[PDB]
Write a protein that binds this ligand. Structure first.
Ligand code: SAH
Ligand code: SAH
Ligand code: MG
Ligand code: MG
Lengths: 242, 242
């Protein structure tokens, strides 16, 4: 209701990790990520860690892994659902070739404007088509208009977690055969391992349930092959088979 | 040579995980791996779990990740250093196209023969050229016979960990530009996060130091881009730049 509003401080899980210690995560970041992180990504990360929804920011080691996947599969056209301040978006734009194209969807353009100066300074703003909207209507609009020549190589899904299964029904048609769909946060702070988990915020409990259902759905889906990867907060890579 | 025993039972770290939660690792395996694991991989894993060097067996969730990488980058010719009973080898042979080829190197073919019946029943033995040898002489011989047109798409490095930096100097010449080298176990039970770690078998301590040195080397190496990934016991993906 009326008041000051929602805080990540209201959330039970924001201090949780899936790795065995903070020291191991910090080792990975300092040894293997920060020396390889573009200066503009570093700047965008540092301002975002002061933001009120900083817990949503994609992990920097996960960022380098997404970049690696994009380059190894020679992706050119991608879609991103859930932009926030733009860390995964700038990661993707830096990884794609000069003529790469990204369709980036987020309900809140004000977050994107936080990262836009870093994206501009990195010289890759020209690859991004940002759409301010709930993602489901955009995807449904694409599906009546897109042709085979416009299919995406890669999709990164990092928006409202309870809608992932609904996004999946559209994305297995919008990503090419042999293309990849990556769902972020599919281990949800480790809570998915438990049929009950005490003391969660109502929205956190909704995601625990939705990810437990989604992980079963993806594992059963004959239209894709999958790999769930314990990096960041967990992600699941899907590769479209037909 | 003479010295102290170095069997798996003499090691300290066998049961340590890099994930905080044994339940979380079990959830990943039960939900996203076992339902997607080839019957012959299951059989090979099960007999290997009973073997005296079971600690060396690649994790099954890591297996599916490697298979995903191979498919997404359309790998066709690969090299594997460190075969053991053949789980990553069978994973790779199943992922490659029907005319794919693997050069598989191990000092001990009796390990390979444990897994060979499963590889044969899977119908993919024909993709494997197994070389019973120390890897370094084989790679040096390859350097003098290999032509530009036969460079490997992908290398998986999982053999004797203190030698990884030596393998790297050959592999950045044996894998094509844009190809991938994957080094297994680069987080070494999480012990790489500390300058010293008490209670280790000397061979375990040697790997801890060699991985701390390797991780710094790879992060500083301009010939590759990298992504260190906290899956299994940790792995580092390298993409050759020139
Ligand atoms: N229905 C919806 N459609 C599109 N975006 C949505 C959405 N619901 C929430 N979002 C957006 O999804 C984002 C999730 S956070 C995304 C993090 C970002 N990918 C990174 O690299 O850090 C938020 O910016 C939120 O505004
Ligand atoms: N110098 C060397 N050259 C080649 N292989 C070696 C080696 N030293 C040890 N090895 C082999 O490296 C293997 C490491 S265990 C490999 C695990 C396997 N890839 C899996 O998927 O489970 C052992 O089989 C060991 O015999
Ligand atoms: Mg996320
Ligand atoms: Mg290994």
């Amino acid at each position: 209701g009326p008041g000051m509003g929602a805080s990540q401080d209201d959330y039970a899980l924001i201090h949780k990790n899936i790795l065995h210690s903070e020291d191991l995560l910090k080792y990975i970041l300092e040894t293997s990520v920060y020396p390889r992180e573009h200066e503009q990504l570093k700047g965008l990360r540092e301002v975002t860690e002061k933001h009120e929804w900083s817990t949503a920011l994609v992990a920097a080691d996960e960022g380098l892994f997404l970049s690696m996947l994009l380059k190894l599969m020679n992706a050119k056209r991608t879609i991103e659902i859930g932009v926030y301040t733009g860390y995964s978006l700038l990661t993707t734009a830096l990884a794609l070739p000069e003529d790469g194209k990204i369709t980036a969807i987020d309900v809140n353009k004000s977050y994107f404007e936080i990262g836009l100066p870093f994206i501009q300074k990195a010289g890759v703003e020209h690859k991004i088509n940002f759409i301010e909207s709930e993602a489901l209507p955009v995807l449904d609009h694409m599906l009546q208009e897109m042709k085979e020549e416009d299919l995406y190589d890669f999709a990164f899904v990092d928006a409202d977690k309870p809608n992932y299964a609904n996004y999946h029904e559209r994305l297995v048609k919008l990503v090419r055969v042999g293309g990849a769909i990556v769902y972020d946060n599919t281990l949800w702070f480790g809570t998915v391992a438990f049929p009950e988990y005490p003391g969660l915020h109502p929205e956190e409990e909704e995601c625990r349930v939705s990810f437990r259902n989604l992980n079963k759905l993806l594992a059963a889906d004959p239209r894709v092959e999958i790999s769930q990867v314990s990096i960041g907060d967990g992600l699941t890579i899907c590769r479209r088979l037909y």
